[PDB]
Design a protein around this ligand. Sequence first.
Ligand SMILES: N=C(NCCCSC[C@H]1O[C@@H](n2cnc3c(N)ncnc32)[C@H](O)[C@@H]1O)NCc1ccccc1
Ligand SMILES: N=C(NCCCSC[C@H]1O[C@@H](n2cnc3c(N)ncnc32)[C@H](O)[C@@H]1O)NCc1ccccc1
Lengths: 303, 303
Amino acid sequence: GHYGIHEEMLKDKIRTESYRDFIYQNPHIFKDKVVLDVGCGTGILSMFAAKAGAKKVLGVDQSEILYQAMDIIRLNKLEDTITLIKGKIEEVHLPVEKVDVIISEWMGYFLLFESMLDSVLYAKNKYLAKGGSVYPDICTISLVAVSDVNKHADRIAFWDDVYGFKMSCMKKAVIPEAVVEVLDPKTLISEPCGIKHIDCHTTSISDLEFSSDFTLKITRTSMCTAIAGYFDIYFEKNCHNRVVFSTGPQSTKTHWKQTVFLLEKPFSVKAGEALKGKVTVHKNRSLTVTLTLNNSTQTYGLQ
Amino acid sequence: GHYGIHEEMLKDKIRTESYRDFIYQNPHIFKDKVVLDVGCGTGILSMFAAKAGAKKVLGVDQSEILYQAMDIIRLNKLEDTITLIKGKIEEVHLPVEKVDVIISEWMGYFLLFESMLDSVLYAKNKYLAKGGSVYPDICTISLVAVSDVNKHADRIAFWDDVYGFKMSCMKKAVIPEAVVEVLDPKTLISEPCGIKHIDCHTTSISDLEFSSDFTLKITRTSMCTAIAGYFDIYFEKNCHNRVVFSTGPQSTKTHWKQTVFLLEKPFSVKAGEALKGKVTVHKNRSLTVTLTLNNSTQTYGLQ
Ligand SMILES: N=C(NCCCSC[C@H]1O[C@@H](n2cnc3c(N)ncnc32)[C@H](O)[C@@H]1O)NCc1ccccc1
Ligand SMILES: N=C(NCCCSC[C@H]1O[C@@H](n2cnc3c(N)ncnc32)[C@H](O)[C@@H]1O)NCc1ccccc1
């Protein structure tokens, strides 16, 4: 849509340079191939593919941004290789039956919030040639335990005394809202636990709604105040130069930051304890995350 | 609307403590009076007025937030003094003909963007008793010249080389968008110039659309890259303890920050030069700001 989204994504060096490195360092995946960029935005991924030796690149975006991409492709004299089409990938007519390669940046906060994966899976199933490839091809979601009584008090306890007046009843609107923010790695009190693994080659839309039992290996005796979620992105299939980036707190921050699920009742944990919980994701545009931990259940959404 | 707006406003200590100080330090304005809070949100201003000795406080808000205000007024046992009404101030039926005092926090970015003043002026004209008072009663808007070639390059030059590709054509979408951000006071290169003075007692809706010639007294030989706008808020009428706060860069930051209008062509200025320009504000929900400076004109809006 608005240029501000595309500025934020383009200024994410981890995001954009991971895609650039994967493409430039694996040109055999692109040489003389037909490539589809699903949600191309400004078209930077289409221009990477072009430079790595793509025969033909089809950039598709439903938003106004595609008209800026048309000027950008002309400014870079790539109009002979990159053809741009406005519309939903679900609706547009392509000047080919099949593509060799699909690339997309489809990933939302906590991977699946307001994600485009459903649109990318549609492209796969309709347009991907026999033996073709989609990138990134592998994604994981992780949870990690957090101790931060100060940030918890800033968001929750805050409402008990507001310039001398009780606003306690506000807590019930705040707890259920997941927070997208950068965590201080110092506040992590468990080993991470994988809760979801996706190969975009084999996954369906139905697999994006899932449940996982998890265990957090507690590494610090502390008050547990939150669970943080993040995702890892991998470019693996047919790569001589494989590329991974993490949106986890231990790694260089990205525009995805981390997704934080606040506990109503923080509870003490011991170094070496195996903290057992359950999480379920429902596509209930807008998706929800149900967490069971310490004999309490809360459903979280994102604003 | 959403609690997140009300959290941000409540956590603005300059904003909320200026209203608190005005009310608590001038209780003669409130003692045994009927008070209307236009857009009361969580109702904090209504609870201040109550504590300063208001006979009766009417809090009006069109949003869901009013149901949270009903619980908050009950939690603080003020339901006998504060009565809350859901609806537009323009539509609701009040259990009185006239009020003695109107209070509101109605102010938007650059004072007038997505401001509520039109709703507050309606309340004035329909409900304010003969000789009554509205607060804050006086507001000013100022411009100040900025030198910051690095922030300008971060936002504009950025688009000339994006991982080796030209995106220059993106500049025409970016320049016209005013930026709400905190300015380093060190980057100011002029004395401020007032461009607008409002008394809420006498102003009409038509006066909020205005033009002003301005002069910026340049205090530093530099490249001028932007014009910044801010506003000052005054509580004056009938006060023994008058209260002002500024949202200008020289003052403690607020959630209003400052509004920055980027120049397409930065131009050199000299210490002691009188830089002459014109500005016009049009209500063209969404309002526009036309700036003439150095023989160039640009119209800016806010996203
Ligand atoms: N990093 C991401 N990345 C997820 C995808 C964002 S939309 C990225 C682009 O894809 C386009 N799009 C979306 N659904 C589409 C469809 N069915 N068919 C064709 N074009 C489609 C949309 O116009 C936009 O330009 N999101 C997080 C984020 C991004 C920016 C700022 C904050 C957070
Ligand atoms: N500080 C402000 N402050 C300006 C007013 C914000 S709206 C503040 C409150 O007034 C309500 N409201 C708006 N128009 C109304 C009407 N006609 N009738 C009744 N109630 C009305 C709205 O539901 C909201 O709760 N804005 C800047 C800001 C605020 C929060 C976060 C970022 C920026």
